Every structure is written in C-alpha cells, then in structure tokens.
Amino acid sequence: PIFLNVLEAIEPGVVCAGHDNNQPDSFAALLSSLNELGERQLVHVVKWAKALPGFRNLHVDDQMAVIQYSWMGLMVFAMGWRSFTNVNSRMLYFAPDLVFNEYRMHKSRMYSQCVRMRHLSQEFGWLQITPQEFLCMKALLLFSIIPVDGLKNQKFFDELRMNYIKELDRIIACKRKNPTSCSRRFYQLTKLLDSVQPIARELHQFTFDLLIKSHMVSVDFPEMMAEIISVQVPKILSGKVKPIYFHTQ
Numbered sequence: 001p002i003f004l005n006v007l008e009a010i011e012p013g014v015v016c017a018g019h020d021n022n023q024p025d026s027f028a029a030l031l032s033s034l035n036e037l038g039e040r041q042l043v044h045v046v047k048w049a050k051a052l053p054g055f056r057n058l059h060v061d062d063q064m065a066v067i068q069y070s071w072m073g074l075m076v077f078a079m080g081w082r083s084f085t086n087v088n089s090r091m092l093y094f095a096p097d098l099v100f101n102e103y104r105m106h107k108s109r110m111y112s113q114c115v116r117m118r119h120l121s122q123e124f125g126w127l128q129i130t131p132q133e134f135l136c137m138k139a140l141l142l143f144s145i146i147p148v149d150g151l152k153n154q155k156f157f158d159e160l161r162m163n164y165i166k167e168l169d170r171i172i173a174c175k176r177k178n179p180t181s182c183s184r185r186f187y188q189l190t191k192l193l194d195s196v197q198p199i200a201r202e203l204h205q206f207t208f209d210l211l212i213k214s215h216m217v218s219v220d221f222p223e224m225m226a227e228i229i230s231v232q233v234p235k236i237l238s239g240k241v242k243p244i245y246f247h248t249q
C-alpha cells in the first residue's frame with residue numbers, strides 16, 4: 001500500500017475561510033469569504049499536487065494547467081467529503097468557520113448549486129465511500145480536465161492518468177471475491193466521479209459571471225482567483241478545455 005501511504009501522507013489539513021461570523025449573512029460577505037477560501041485552498045492544492053506520485057514528470061507548464069483547470073472539481077469534491085464526515089451532509093461544510101445552513105444557501109444566491117453539492121455530498125453516504133476510495137478518486141480528479149487539442153506533453157499525461165485509474169481499481173480490489181461486486185463498484189465510482197463535472201461547470205459559469213459584475217456588487221476576488229477566473233475559466237466555458245468523462249453524456 002505504498003501509493004495509499006503517500007496519498008494519506010500528503011492530504012491537506014483543515015483550511016479556515018477567515019470569515020467574520022459576527023457580520024450579517026449578506027451576499028457580498030458570503031461570496032468574498034468563499035473567494036478568500038478558494039485562494040487559500042489553491043495554495044494547498046498546488047503543494048499537494050506536486051507531491052503526488054509521478055506529477056513532477058509532467059511538463060512544468062502542464063503541471064500549472066491541470067491544476068488551474070481542475071481546482072473547482074477538486075475543492076467541490078473534498079468539500080462534499082468534509083460535509084459528509086462532520087455534519088452527515090446536512091449542511092455545506094466549506095470550512096470550520098463557513099458552514100452553510102439553508103439561509104446561507106439562499107443568501108449566497110447559489111441555492112440550486114448548493115443543492116447539487118449537497119446531493120454530491122450525500123452520495124458519499126449512499127455509496128459508503130471509504131477514505132481510501134475518496135483519496136484516490138480525488139487524485140483522479142486532478143487528471144480529469146484538459147484542452148481539446150492536448151497538453152505540451154500529452155503522452156506523459158496519458159500514462160499518468162492510466163496509473164491513477166489502475167490505483168483506484170486496486171483500492172476497490174484489495175477487499176472482494178465473487179466478481180459482479182467489483183464490477184458494480186468500479187461502475188458506481190466512475191459514475192460518481194463523472195457527476196462532479198456538471199456541478200463544477202455550473203460553478204465555473206457562476207463565478208465567471210460574478211467576477212464580471214463584482215465591482216457593481218461589492219464582492220472581492222483575491223489576485224490568484226481573479227487571474228484564473230479571467231484567463232483559464234473562460235477556456236472551459238468556451239469549450240477549449242473539456243472534462244474527460246468515463247461514460248458518454
């Protein structure tokens with residue numbers, strides 16, 4: 001279990017949003033805080049990603065690019081896990097200082113997106129996902145969205161991604177005998193992983209739209225979130241970068 005040792009070792013800790021819970025739950029303040037949270041989580045994603053097995057093998061610009069495309073899905077997925085483990089998915093556990101109850105979901109003007117995240121969160125319970133399955137799935141999300149005309153070194157990305165797939169299939173297989181079980185489970189998890197993309201994409205639209213009208217609406221975007229949402233997000237919205245699904249939509 002060397003591969004799991006590593007995933008378990010490099011797993012980031014609690015990251016706080018910095019939200020002043022004394023302030024009244026407004027849109028402006030809810031969204032600026034989610035944005036600061038994003039920026040803070042980004043630092044930890046960079047650090048986690050570079051320590052993943054095989055990751056520095058990728059061309060250096062490709063390293064930056066896969067992080068910059070996939071962050072939304074990584075963070076959304078980890079947030080659902082957190083939500084599942086700390087609050088049985090009843091609310092959205094963005095951070096220990098930024099838990100969204102129903103009121104906050106309405107106030108953030110994202111209610112239907114949060115509903116979709118809460119569903120994603122509950123799949124962890126419905127499927128009885130293990131911490132091992134979770135870590136390997138999250139690692140595979142790093143490798144699940146790319147430009148349609150390839151990366152700088154695509155051949156290396158393809159072998160790497162294949163190895164992560166092999167690893168998740170292992171994590172399922174150290175466990176079971178009579179083999180419809182292992183087939184159903186791999187099916188279940190590839191389906192779950194696919195389900196992160198449409199949600200990620202809603203949040204891409206929303207944050208983009210938000211950044212456009214941000215000065216009109218008193219929502220702050222920190223430097224890195226501003227740059228990524230203006231330079232890389234639109235490549236996704238314009239279909240120059242697309243998720244890699246397991247099953248056709």
Ligand SMILES: Cc1ccc(OCCn2c(SCCC(=O)O)nc3ccccc32)cc1
Pocket residue numbers: 003053054055057058155156157159160162163164166167
């Ligand atoms: C099917 C297969 C292929 C190679 C292999 O070797 C182990 C190396 N390895 C890598 S390097 C990925 C390719 C690249 O950087 O261009 N990443 C791994 C992740 C998990 C386990 C081994 C990994 C093993 C099997």
Ligand SMILES: C[C@]12CC[C@H]3[C@@H](CCC4=CC(=O)CC[C@@]43C)[C@@H]1CC[C@@H]2O
Pocket residue numbers: 031034035037038041071072075076079094095203206207210
């Ligand atoms: C992108 C965004 C800020 C960062 C948020 C994102 C919602 C999903 C999310 C979950 C996290 O746990 C980290 C912060 C992020 C990544 C937010 C939706 C709109 C807002 O602008």
